[PDB]
Paper text:
We struggled to obtain a good quality cryo-EM map of full-length Sak80α. The full-length dataset presented two major challenges: severe particle orientation preference and the absence of the flexible CTD, which is a common issue with Rad52-like annealases. Consequently, we decided to focus on a truncated version of Sak80α where its CTD was removed, Sak80α∆CTD. The data set of Sak80α∆CTD exhibited improved behavior. The 2D averages from this dataset revealed stable ringed structures of different sizes, with octadecamers being the predominant form, which was used for the final reconstruction. It shows the groove commonly seen in SSAPs to accommodate ssDNA in the outer surface of the torus, known as the ssDNA binding groove or ssDBG. Truncated version of each protein where their CTDs were removed (Sak80α∆CTD, SSB80α∆C7), proved that these two proteins coordinate their functions via their CTDs.
Author numbering:
A (entry chain A), B (entry chain A), C (entry chain A), D (entry chain A), E (entry chain A): 4 to 131
Write the structure that this text describes.
């Protein structure tokens, strides 16, 4: 068949967490399923220059913008790349203004952006 | 036949949400239908220099203008590219002035601009 | 025959909205009719430097002038290009002074300029 | 015969509006008559540097002079170009001083300058 | 015979207006008579740098001098060019000082300078 249809036709319902009334598939499950399909696949978290620090060659792993925070994750399986963006959010799914976000929030957003970019491939597309 | 007519003759009415009295087709449905027609298609969100931050090589994913906010999405299916613009808007469909928009608003506008650019292709043109 | 006469001899009266006592043909209808005649046609919205912001490589999609706002749309069907200009206007068809226009107004003016440039081709010339 | 005589010998009286006691032929009629004679003809609205704004590569579609406003339209039919100038005027046909003209006034003057330049060709010369 | 004698021996008395006790032949009549004699003839309105505005590449269509206003028109029929100058004047045929002239006055002076330059050719020389 094809990668999209094979991956799309799977049930990731069992490995999900209901937090805030939303459904999330854990990254651990996503990491193994793609690993099975393709043994060698790449996950890259983009790094962007920081607006406040002017030191040269200083690149943080997230985008800080005057309006908030952004993350980017690029998942490449079998020579196909799917990029994704996401806003960093609170535990209550509310936006975080400049200077109100901790490093633990960014890491959670980075992990969440990975499982969503994988959903651009057939796996668990129905949840999003 | 042709891509426009094939895509135009589909019913996307079932997968729609009535919010504020407007009809919207979910991106998830748009992502799969184009994926079926063409296995390898590209979605690109344009990035523009930011008016307030003067750091070099700093590119946000939206356009901030003294009059408001703009987003752009370019969808390429089978070597044909359809670009689209849209204003970032509130939950009540009202405009957001400079310094009043959160990152969650931009992401929603980005997703909405994707399904509208896909409607430039035959799919779900009737809604817009 | 010829493109002008074929396009000119059509009834776009059914797909019109009477707002403020003026007659407007919806863009959706214009997008499909030209798409039928020519499968591959281009719509380009011109981008102009902004008078107030001095950042380099900053190009907004409209013209802000000390006297008001202008938009431009270039529609190319079958290797023929028809450019058009229009003033951005209120819901009451009144002019908007510098600093009084929202991004929702510009987008409406951009869509309206598209259907008028298409009317430079035979389609719906009688309305304007 | 010749273009001037053919075009000159036409009755554009039916398609005229009596406003302020003057006679005007609508642009829509002018656009179709020249289109018939010549399928491919060009209309160009000249763009001039603006006296107040010093930004580079900033070109408005009208001429603002310390004494008032000017517009220019160049109509080319069958390899012959007829340029024309006109002052931007009020609804009462009075002059507009620097800083008193809206974008709606400029557009009306641009359309009027087009039908007058076409009158340099035989069509509707008698009105002016 | 010759262009001067042929053109000189015509009666333009019928197409004249008596304003302020002077006789003027309308431009419309002049435009058609030369058009008949020569199908392709050129009218050029000279453009001069403006004394007050220092912006580069800014050229108005008239000459503003500390003593008043001047216009120039060059009419070329059959490879012969006749230039002409004229002062911009009020409705009462009085001079206009720097900063007292509107764009409507300049346009009237431009049209009048055209019919006088044509009178350098035989047509209607007797009036001036």
């Amino acid at each position: 068949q094809t990668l999209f249809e094979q991956l799309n036709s799977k049930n990731v319902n069992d490995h999900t967490e209901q937090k805030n009334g939303l459904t999330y598939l854990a990254w651990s499950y996503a990491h193994q399923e793609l690993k099975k399909i393709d043994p060698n696949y790449t996950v890259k978290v983009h790094e962007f220059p920081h607006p406040d620090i002017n030191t040269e060659n200083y690149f943080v792993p997230y985008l800080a913008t005057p309006e908030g925070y952004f993350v980017q994750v690029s998942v490449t399986v079998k020579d196909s790349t799917e990029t994704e963006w996401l806003p960093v959010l609170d535990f209550r799914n509310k936006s975080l203004a400049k200077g109100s976000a901790t490093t633990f929030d960014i890491n959670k957003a980075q992990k969440r952006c990975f499982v969503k970019a994988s959903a651009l491939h057939g796996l668990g597309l129905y949840i999003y």
